Structure formats: C-alpha cells, structure tokens
Design an enzyme around this catalytic site. Sequence first.
Site, PDB file in Angstrom:
ATOM      1  N   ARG A   1      -4.377   2.555  51.401  1.00 27.90           N
ATOM      2  CA  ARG A   1      -4.075   1.211  51.923  1.00 27.90           C
ATOM      3  C   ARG A   1      -2.703   0.691  51.528  1.00 27.90           C
ATOM      4  O   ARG A   1      -2.367  -0.427  51.915  1.00 27.90           O
ATOM      5  CB  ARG A   1      -5.124   0.199  51.459  1.00 27.90           C
ATOM      6  CG  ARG A   1      -6.441   0.302  52.190  1.00 27.90           C
ATOM      7  CD  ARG A   1      -7.387  -0.724  51.664  1.00 27.90           C
ATOM      8  NE  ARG A   1      -7.947  -0.349  50.366  1.00 27.90           N
ATOM      9  CZ  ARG A   1      -8.590  -1.203  49.587  1.00 27.90           C
ATOM     10  NH1 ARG A   1      -8.736  -2.460  49.996  1.00 27.90           N
ATOM     11  NH2 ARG A   1      -9.089  -0.811  48.418  1.00 27.90           N
TER      12      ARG A   1
ATOM     13  N   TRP B   1      -2.580   9.866  57.919  1.00 19.38           N
ATOM     14  CA  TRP B   1      -2.359  11.260  57.555  1.00 19.38           C
ATOM     15  C   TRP B   1      -3.384  11.643  56.504  1.00 19.38           C
ATOM     16  O   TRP B   1      -4.026  10.780  55.895  1.00 19.38           O
ATOM     17  CB  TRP B   1      -0.934  11.523  57.040  1.00 19.38           C
ATOM     18  CG  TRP B   1      -0.516  10.540  56.022  1.00 19.38           C
ATOM     19  CD1 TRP B   1      -0.796  10.572  54.679  1.00 19.38           C
ATOM     20  CD2 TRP B   1       0.217   9.338  56.252  1.00 19.38           C
ATOM     21  NE1 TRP B   1      -0.259   9.468  54.060  1.00 19.38           N
ATOM     22  CE2 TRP B   1       0.367   8.693  55.005  1.00 19.38           C
ATOM     23  CE3 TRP B   1       0.770   8.745  57.391  1.00 19.38           C
ATOM     24  CZ2 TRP B   1       1.050   7.487  54.867  1.00 19.38           C
ATOM     25  CZ3 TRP B   1       1.444   7.549  57.254  1.00 19.38           C
ATOM     26  CH2 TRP B   1       1.578   6.927  56.002  1.00 19.38           C
TER      27      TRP B   1
HETATM   28  C1  HEM Z   1      -2.195   6.450  56.022  1.00 19.63           C
HETATM   29  C2  HEM Z   1      -2.912   7.411  55.435  1.00 19.63           C
HETATM   30  C3  HEM Z   1      -4.395   7.238  55.050  1.00 19.63           C
HETATM   31  C4  HEM Z   1      -4.993   7.918  54.054  1.00 19.63           C
HETATM   32  C5  HEM Z   1      -4.341   8.966  53.116  1.00 19.63           C
HETATM   33  C6  HEM Z   1      -6.370   7.487  53.999  1.00 19.63           C
HETATM   34  C7  HEM Z   1      -7.312   7.951  53.105  1.00 19.63           C
HETATM   35  C8  HEM Z   1      -8.651   7.653  53.132  1.00 19.63           C
HETATM   36  C9  HEM Z   1      -9.707   8.366  52.434  1.00 19.63           C
HETATM   37  C10 HEM Z   1      -9.519   9.609  51.515  1.00 19.63           C
HETATM   38  C11 HEM Z   1     -10.863   7.752  52.717  1.00 19.63           C
HETATM   39  C12 HEM Z   1     -12.251   8.188  52.205  1.00 19.63           C
HETATM   40  C13 HEM Z   1     -12.994   8.805  53.392  1.00 19.63           C
HETATM   41  C14 HEM Z   1     -13.654  10.100  53.005  1.00 19.63           C
HETATM   42  O1  HEM Z   1     -13.141  10.769  52.073  1.00 19.63           O
HETATM   43  O2  HEM Z   1     -14.682  10.480  53.627  1.00 19.63           O
HETATM   44  C15 HEM Z   1     -10.582   6.630  53.611  1.00 19.63           C
HETATM   45  C16 HEM Z   1     -11.475   5.728  54.146  1.00 19.63           C
HETATM   46  C17 HEM Z   1     -11.189   4.723  55.059  1.00 19.63           C
HETATM   47  N1  HEM Z   1      -9.953   4.387  55.579  1.00 19.63           N
HETATM   48 FE1  HEM Z   1      -8.181   5.102  55.006  1.00 19.63          FE
HETATM   49  N2  HEM Z   1      -6.581   6.540  54.992  1.00 19.63           N
HETATM   50  C18 HEM Z   1      -5.384   6.361  55.668  1.00 19.63           C
HETATM   51  C19 HEM Z   1      -5.178   5.497  56.735  1.00 19.63           C
HETATM   52  C20 HEM Z   1      -6.068   4.576  57.223  1.00 19.63           C
HETATM   53  C21 HEM Z   1      -5.896   3.745  58.403  1.00 19.63           C
HETATM   54  C22 HEM Z   1      -4.639   3.800  59.305  1.00 19.63           C
HETATM   55  C23 HEM Z   1      -7.004   2.987  58.513  1.00 19.63           C
HETATM   56  C24 HEM Z   1      -7.398   1.916  59.535  1.00 19.63           C
HETATM   57  C25 HEM Z   1      -6.536   1.467  60.431  1.00 19.63           C
HETATM   58  C26 HEM Z   1      -7.886   3.300  57.416  1.00 19.63           C
HETATM   59  C27 HEM Z   1      -9.110   2.733  57.170  1.00 19.63           C
HETATM   60  C28 HEM Z   1     -10.118   3.332  56.449  1.00 19.63           C
HETATM   61  C29 HEM Z   1     -11.520   2.995  56.480  1.00 19.63           C
HETATM   62  C30 HEM Z   1     -12.103   1.861  57.348  1.00 19.63           C
HETATM   63  C31 HEM Z   1     -12.166   3.823  55.631  1.00 19.63           C
HETATM   64  C32 HEM Z   1     -13.672   3.933  55.278  1.00 19.63           C
HETATM   65  C33 HEM Z   1     -14.361   2.633  54.916  1.00 19.63           C
HETATM   66  C34 HEM Z   1     -15.851   2.872  54.957  1.00 19.63           C
HETATM   67  O3  HEM Z   1     -16.294   4.053  55.021  1.00 19.63           O
HETATM   68  O4  HEM Z   1     -16.597   1.865  54.941  1.00 19.63           O
HETATM   69  N3  HEM Z   1      -7.281   4.269  56.655  1.00 19.63           N
HETATM   70  N4  HEM Z   1      -9.220   6.607  53.836  1.00 19.63           N
HETATM   71  C1  LIG Z   2     -20.524   9.790  57.365  1.00 22.07           C
HETATM   72  C2  LIG Z   2     -19.290   9.093  56.826  1.00 22.07           C
HETATM   73  N1  LIG Z   2     -18.417  10.007  56.063  1.00 22.07           N
HETATM   74  C3  LIG Z   2     -18.343  11.325  56.716  1.00 22.07           C
HETATM   75  C4  LIG Z   2     -17.065   9.418  55.967  1.00 22.07           C
HETATM   76  C5  LIG Z   2     -16.570   9.108  57.374  1.00 22.07           C
HETATM   77  C6  LIG Z   2     -15.373   8.181  57.462  1.00 22.07           C
HETATM   78  C7  LIG Z   2     -15.559   6.926  58.039  1.00 22.07           C
HETATM   79  C8  LIG Z   2     -14.496   6.037  58.173  1.00 22.07           C
HETATM   80  F1  LIG Z   2     -14.696   4.824  58.722  1.00 22.07           F
HETATM   81  C9  LIG Z   2     -13.237   6.414  57.741  1.00 22.07           C
HETATM   82  F2  LIG Z   2     -12.182   5.588  57.855  1.00 22.07           F
HETATM   83  C10 LIG Z   2     -13.034   7.657  57.182  1.00 22.07           C
HETATM   84  O1  LIG Z   2     -11.750   7.929  56.785  1.00 22.07           O
HETATM   85  C11 LIG Z   2     -11.150   9.191  57.007  1.00 22.07           C
HETATM   86  C12 LIG Z   2      -9.654   9.005  57.110  1.00 22.07           C
HETATM   87  C13 LIG Z   2      -9.104   8.173  58.079  1.00 22.07           C
HETATM   88  C14 LIG Z   2      -7.724   8.025  58.153  1.00 22.07           C
HETATM   89  C15 LIG Z   2      -7.085   7.141  59.219  1.00 22.07           C
HETATM   90  C16 LIG Z   2      -6.919   8.714  57.265  1.00 22.07           C
HETATM   91  C17 LIG Z   2      -7.512   9.541  56.310  1.00 22.07           C
HETATM   92  N2  LIG Z   2      -6.757  10.223  55.426  1.00 22.07           N
HETATM   93  N3  LIG Z   2      -8.850   9.670  56.255  1.00 22.07           N
HETATM   94  C18 LIG Z   2     -14.097   8.556  57.038  1.00 22.07           C
END
Ligand code: HEM
Ligand SMILES: CCN(C)CCc1cc(F)c(F)c(OCc2cc(C)cc(N)n2)c1
Lengths: 414, 414
Positions: free
Chosen positions: B115, B284
């Site tokens: 974030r 990414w």
């Molecule tokens: C810019 C590089 C970004 C990286 C490195 C990143 C990284 C991550 C990671 C590692 C997770 C955990 C998901 C998992 O491991 O299963 C996550 C969750 C999430 N990301 Fe980020 N993300 C990025 C961009 C974004 C963007 C652009 C958005 C929305 C516009 C976003 C919104 C979210 C949301 C909504 C979740 C999960 C929340 C939930 O599960 O309730 N991310 N992200």
């Molecule tokens: C069953 C749920 N479980 C599999 C996690 C799924 C999940 C839900 C979600 F809303 C997420 F934003 C999410 O993020 C992955 C993600 C998204 C972005 C833009 C970047 C990076 N680097 N990574 C991953």
Amino acid sequence: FLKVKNWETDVVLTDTLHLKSTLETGCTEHICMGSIMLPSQHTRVATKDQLFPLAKEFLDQYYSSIKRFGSKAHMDRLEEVNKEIESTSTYQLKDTELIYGAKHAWRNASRCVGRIQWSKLQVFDARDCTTAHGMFNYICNHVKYATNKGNLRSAITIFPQRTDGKHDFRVWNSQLIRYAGYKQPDGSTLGDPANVQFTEICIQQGWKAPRGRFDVLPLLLQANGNDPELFQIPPELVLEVPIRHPKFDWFKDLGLKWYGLPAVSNMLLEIGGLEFSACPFSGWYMGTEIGVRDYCDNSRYNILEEVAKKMDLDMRKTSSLWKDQALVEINIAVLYSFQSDKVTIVDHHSATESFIKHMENEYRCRGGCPADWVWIVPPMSGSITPVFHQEMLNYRLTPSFEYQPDPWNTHVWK
Amino acid sequence: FLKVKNWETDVVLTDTLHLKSTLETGCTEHICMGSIMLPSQHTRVATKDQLFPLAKEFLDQYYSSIKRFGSKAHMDRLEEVNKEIESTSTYQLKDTELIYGAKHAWRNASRCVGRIQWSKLQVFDARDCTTAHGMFNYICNHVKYATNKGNLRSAITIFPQRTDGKHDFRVWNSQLIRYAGYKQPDGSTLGDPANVQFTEICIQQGWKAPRGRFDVLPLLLQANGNDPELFQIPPELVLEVPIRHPKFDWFKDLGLKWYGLPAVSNMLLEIGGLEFSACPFSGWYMGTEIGVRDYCDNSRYNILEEVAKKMDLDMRKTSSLWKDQALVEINIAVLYSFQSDKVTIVDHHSATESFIKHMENEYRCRGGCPADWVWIVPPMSGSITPVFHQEMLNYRLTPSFEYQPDPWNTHVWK
Ligand code: HEM
Ligand SMILES: CCN(C)CCc1cc(F)c(F)c(OCc2cc(C)cc(N)n2)c1
Ligand code: HEM
Ligand SMILES: CCN(C)CCc1cc(F)c(F)c(OCc2cc(C)cc(N)n2)c1
Ligand SMILES: C[C@H](O)[C@H](O)[C@H]1CNc2nc(N)[nH]c(=O)c2N1
Ligand SMILES: C[C@H](O)[C@H](O)[C@H]1CNc2nc(N)[nH]c(=O)c2N1
Ligand SMILES: [Zn+2]
C-alpha cells in the site's frame, strides 16, 4: 457454534468451547488487536468477593472432569472452600485440583503450539516453600527432572500463591536457563541482548560475570516478598547442545551452542481465582525458537551475516534472499545438533502437524481449542506448515497462564 | 488513542484513525477471529435510506481531502447528490470522487503490504460500458497499460455500479491472468488446482482448452446481468517470465513460468455506498506470492518435492528441513527470473520494509494505518522481515474492497 476451516484440506471444525469463555481478549466489534504482543488483558490484585465464583467455576469443571459432577463430594468441596473463603478470604487447592488446574492452564494457552502434550505434565507442588534456598532446591530438582539427560519431560513447579500481594514468590529470571547479555564499549552486545537489563541487575546484586557469550545466568529468587538472592544452578544440571552442521564443517567454528531446556519462569498461573506468581514450567524446544528467533532476530544474537559470510552469499542486494538461505541452514544445524545428542527437539513441521492433530481432538472431545494464529504459525516457512492454512478462534479460558510485570519494577525494596 | 509498538526497534505509533472506523470486524470482546479467511463482514444488497449517510460520509472526507471541507462547493455537492438520491434512489460519482474513492479503497486494504503506492494508482473509468465486448476492450487496455512492457504500473478499471442487483457487471475470473487447471484420470491435477472449477466452467461455456500446464485462461465477462461470454486476451498482451535459477541450470528443465501481472478481478469496490461489482485491479508481484504460495502450496502447483529431488535433498526425515531449503531456492529463482527480464517484482524483505515506512507516514499524516498482521507477514521467513515484529491494529475503513460470492452461485441464468 462457530465454524473454522482448514483451507489446505477443506476440513471444517465446529467450536462451542468458546461459549464457556470468560475473560476478554482486547478485540472489539470495531477493532482487532490480535497482533498486540502483551494486551492489557494478558497481564495481571483480587479480593474475596469475586473469589468464590472463580472457585465455584473451577471446582465445577474439575468434578465434571473426574466424571462426578454435582455429586456429594462436589457439593461438600464447594461448601468446604466456601467456608474457607469466608474465614480466610482465600483458600487452598487440593493436590489433585492443582495438578488439574496446571495442566489445563497449559491446555488453554492459545499461543502454545506444543499443547498436544498437555495431559502429560509433571506437577511439582512447591507450596510448602518459605525461603529463596528452598526455591533454589525445588528449581534444581525441576531442572534435573525435566532435563532427564536429554530425554526431556514436561514439568511445572508451583510456589506458594500470592496472598496479600506484598508477600509474593517470584523467579526474577525470564527463564531458568538464559545466557547473559553484556553491553560493550562501542555499544554492541556480547551474549544475549535480551537479558542485558537482567544481567546487570544480577551484577547489581553481586553476580561475578565471566563476561563471555554463553554464560548461564544465575537464578535471582524472591521468596515471600523478601529481596531476591543469587544462586548458580550446578553446571552439571544445565545441559547444552553445541551447534554443528551436517555439511559445513566451519559451523563448529561459529562456536555456538544452546541449552536443551526451555523453562519459562516469569509467568503467572491462575487457578480458581488464586494467583501463583512463581510457577516455572518447561518442555522441549521447537527448532525455530533457537535457530530463527534466538539466533537470527536482529536484537538477539544476530548471526545471519556471519553465517551468510561463511556460506559465501550474495550479501549485496536484499533480493538475493541470502538472509533466507542462511536462516534455513542455521535451523538445519540446530535440529541436527540437538538430535545427534539425544536431546529432545521438535522441528516446526512435525510440531505444527501435531498441533493440527491436537486441534482435532480438542474440537471433537472438548468442543474447541483456543488458538492464536499470530503465535502458532512458526516464524519461518509459514505457509508450508499446515497451521498457516488453519483458521483459529482465539479466546481466553481459565485456568490460564498470564503475563505479569517484572518484579524489579514493582518490588518495594529493602 | 491506541498505541502499537515495534518490538524490533521499540518504535511506538499512536492510532487515532481507527476512531473514524465504521464497519465491523468479526471479533468481539470475548473472541478474536483475526485468522478467519473470509469473515462474513468482508463479504457483500442496499436500499436508498442508508444510502445518503454513506454518500455524506464519503463526500465529507473527499472535500476535506482537497482542502475545502464545508465550503459552498461541498454543501452544493451534498445537496446535489441528496437531490439525486431522492429522485433516483442512487447516484453517480464525479470522475474525481471515483479516482479518490478507488485510491482510498486500496489505501484502506488492511491485508495489502503493497500500500505504499496507493496514491499512484491509475483509475480507468469504464462506467460507460454496456457489453461484454466493451468489457473485454477495457480489460485489454488495462492489461496493456498496467503491463507497460514489464515496467509495471498500478491501475484499476471500474465498470458500472450495481443498481437493482440483477443488472450487474462481473468478471468471473478471479484474476484476469490465471493458468488453467485440469483434473486427470488418476485424479491428480495438471495446471493450477485452484482454477479447476473455473477451468471447467469455461469449457462448459465453450472453451477449447489446450490441456497443458500454463494455459492462460480466457476471460468470462458478464455485462449488465447477461450471461457471460468468453474472450481470449491477445497473447502478445500476456507477459510471462520463464523461471530460471542463477546457479542450478536444471531449473530451466523444471520448465516453469509465471505471468508478470497480478490483477484481481472478482472483488467488490465500495464508495459512498455505491457497489462496483467489477473493478479489476493490478500492480506487481511480491516474490513470495508466486514462489511460496503459487508454486509450493500443497493444493497449488506443489513443486517442493520435484525441486528437492533435483537439489539432491534429504527427503526422508521431515526434520531435514528439505522443504525449507527447496523453498528459498524457488523464491531466489522467481525474483532473479523476473528481474533479468525487467519485469517489476519486489522481494518480501524490500516490500515489508516499505510497508513499515508506509505505516509511519499513515500514523503521522493520517493518524493510523489499518493492518492485518495475519496477511502482512510474508509466508516465508516471517520473523526476519520487520513486519513480524510490528504490532498492527486491524479495522475496517471505507472506501474499501470487499469479497463477494462467485457469480455462478448467484447468477440467475438464461
Ligand atoms: C503495487 C504492488 C502490490 C503488491 C506488491 C501487493 C501485495 C499484496 C499481497 C502480498 C497481498 C496478500 C494477498 C495474498 O498473499 O494472497 C495483497 C492483498 C491485497 N491487495 Fe495489494 N498489492 C499490490 C497492489 C494492490 C493494488 C493496486 C490494489 C487495489 C487497487 C491492492 C489491494 C489489495 C487488496 C484489496 C488485498 C486483499 C484484501 C483482502 O483479502 O481482504 N493491492 N496485496
Ligand atoms: C481466496 C483468497 N486468497 C486466495 C487471496 C486472494 C486475494 C484476494 C484479493 F482481494 C487480493 F487483493 C489479493 O491480492 C493479490 C495481489 C493483488 C495485487 C494487485 C498485487 C499483488 N502483488 N497481489 C489476493
Ligand atoms: C512440550 C513442548 C513445548 C513446545 C514445543 C512449546 C512450544 C511453544 C512455542 C513455540 C511457543 C511460542 C513462544 C515463542 O515462540 O516466543 C509457546 C508458547 C507458550 N507455551 Fe508452549 N511449548 C511447550 C511446552 C509448554 C508447557 C509445558 C507449558 C506450560 C506448562 C507451555 C505453555 C505455553 C505458554 C503459556 C505460552 C505463551 C502464551 C502467551 O505468550 O500468552 N508450553 N510454546
Ligand atoms: C516477550 C515475550 N516473548 C519473548 C515470548 C516469551 C514467552 C512467554 C511465555 F509465557 C512462554 F510460554 C513462552 O514460551 C517459550 C517456550 C516454553 C516452553 C515450556 C517450551 C517451548 N518450546 N517454548 C515464551
Ligand atoms: C508484533 C507481534 O505481536 C509479535 O512480533 C509476535 C508475533 N508472533 C509471535 N509468535 C511467537 N511464537 N513468538 C513471538 O514472539 C511472536 N511475536
Ligand atoms: C487460516 C488463514 O486465515 C489463511 O491461511 C491466511 C493466512 N494468511 C494469509 N496471508 C496472505 N497474504 N495470503 C493468504 O492467503 C493468507 N492465508
Ligand atoms: Zn481480533
């Protein structure tokens, strides 16, 4: 009747146990504090009025435990401690109620991954103790027994319960066996940075430090409110595993070692409203607690750079994952070293699988299992262990172990 | 005015932001559900009455954001959407209110470690879209833009908001780019076991699977309630990194690869009470999401044994930590492969440090930062990254991203 899922196996368990829960957690409907390290709820002075429901509640599960809930022996015991709480504004546990309360304090520890062994806990009743020397003797008999020559055994030693609050048994060590921590001229740290405040407290009371790395600290034992006193565990009783690797012969050159016996001494055991401020307990190490946290935490021994050096590791860029590479090696050596010495150790895979096994029986034959995911997930390779994928309900049952302030911040001295 | 500590640095941050919080978490005073994967609070049908306070609340922080809180342009805009909510029982966001709401949905995502980049989010307004083909075109222009030839850029494409509920734009893919999953005769899985239900749904609507490993799935796009339709992203638009290792030349022989563009498409974006059921967003990859979870989860590609084999690893005893050893290697290769191709990737060390940096600014110039520790801590080498030691308050602010049921379990078909 809440449901928790294992997203790796699609197993669903049903938790009703949390309904018997009593204490609060720190979370509310609008905020989750599941990652706060020492919530004000997990820390520990009580009166005689709230004391009987606590006694009642505990006595009702104990007689329910030995099958005879509500019988005459139950009703009499309820009246008996009622009577004793009226007369003394406190009371005394039966030997069996103490063994039961202790085992269930451990059983209820939501942050403990080793709880599959909670029933096989050896309870040493030290409630007759009166002096720091007698504490030292009970503690030494604890160490020797639990150590059992490397075939480690779970045990707890229970010193007298807090009464007034000013007469209080406390072990001032965080663990009975910990390495000393010495600040240096340049500011850096020899030994264990964790204990630097405790190490100088020991010297403040007269310890003669052999100012090296792995100097086993002396015990600082406070008995019945009196000023604590220094006692050195006999070194033949402190088992130690020198850490070698089953590949890298320079690993001995690292010259590291660790004690076999994890034995937390600063916690407070609560049973039926009674407060046991000194209750050291021990089991055996999960590999990661030494090789990940003790050895590689930044503010602990911090050996990742020195191990990476010898491994000839891409230590320039962060993204080389050199830290991760040197961390798996250090844990391979710890496990191997402890095992080649017949000293009981468990790897974080084996331990986290058993915890899932344990969780099954707790939901089946108990209706649930309080678990703190923040703490149950091992601190390396989280998601390749099955607890990463196991949803867990955290709630606070009693009998329980609680944190309590350090004695030197509360002890009305001299 | 709650305090959160970093136990590695003894840094204390003060959280007042959580007071503006509105939604509930699933935790209570007597139970913490911080490890439940999809709490009923994190899932998503609203009326016109509760709709205005939501509009009001969002409009008041937005004009407070562009400095002019409570001015005439504020008061008029409040009256304006008041008027429009009376007349239409819903309303439309200004272009800028949409860009703001989106960026703050991301900003408020407590489970997102990335974030620190929330302000640099590219908002594509697709709210004029009416057909699956137009969806396909907006999505392709999204992919191309965010991919930016490996120099990845954050973006989101916002399709029309839900109105009645039966007219609903939904991308049925979980991510715009995912590999197909095929069950086998013996029962085992080719491709991605995650998508096996989705892959056969695509074939149920007419996909011609090239039944291999890394078969990029087609898009299944539902527009304005109609039955979804299959569209294959042009392959020149799906960038892919073949995974090699900077030591083990047999790593190419593993024949693995991954797409550069993580792009979640199944989530629901909430802004001022309005519900955008299709809003794919991309940034990414953090290394671990591919090399730890995608590659080494048991019910994902499950390559730990095959990598350990080639490494010539002690695969007999569990305590050899062979799984950990083969897991660090796989992540070293993913990072290296993506970097040697100028495809934006971040390692879990660099990403978790930046998150702590981000947390600082959020507590300083915003009064807090909702964070879910269960999810922020990377799934390997937890405690050697600085977020393991950072206490975090989880709370639910809006605008936000919410989960929502899968369309094929809700879609009133044909
Ligand atoms: C810019 C590089 C970004 C990286 C490195 C990143 C990284 C991550 C990671 C590692 C997770 C955990 C998901 C998992 O491991 O299963 C996550 C969750 C999430 N990301 Fe980020 N993300 C990025 C961009 C974004 C963007 C652009 C958005 C929305 C516009 C976003 C919104 C979210 C949301 C909504 C979740 C999960 C929340 C939930 O599960 O309730 N991310 N992200
Ligand atoms: C069953 C749920 N479980 C599999 C996690 C799924 C999940 C839900 C979600 F809303 C997420 F934003 C999410 O993020 C992955 C993600 C998204 C972005 C833009 C970047 C990076 N680097 N990574 C991953
Ligand atoms: C038998 C082998 C045991 C193993 C492998 C084990 C393992 C662990 C581990 C890894 C932790 C997390 C602590 C940390 O990493 O900093 C923990 C916490 C804990 N364990 Fe166990 N333990 C064992 C025995 C015991 C015993 C005998 C007791 C009590 C009688 C106990 C009670 C607790 C408590 C109270 C906590 C911490 C709860 C808190 O911090 O609030 N454990 N244990
Ligand atoms: C500042 C707090 N932090 C350093 C954690 C300290 C802590 C507190 C506590 F009550 C514990 F039981 C604990 O367990 C370590 C432990 C104990 C036993 C018997 C076995 C194993 N294997 N491990 C560790
Ligand atoms: C910030 C967080 O509460 C703190 O770092 C916790 C995280 N989980 C842990 N888990 C275990 N087993 N031991 C610990 O010391 C910690 N530390
Ligand atoms: C049981 C638990 O809720 C579940 O396994 C969570 C744990 N933390 C996670 N953290 C991230 N980033 N991604 C995940 O999928 C999960 N899974
Ligand atoms: Zn909580």
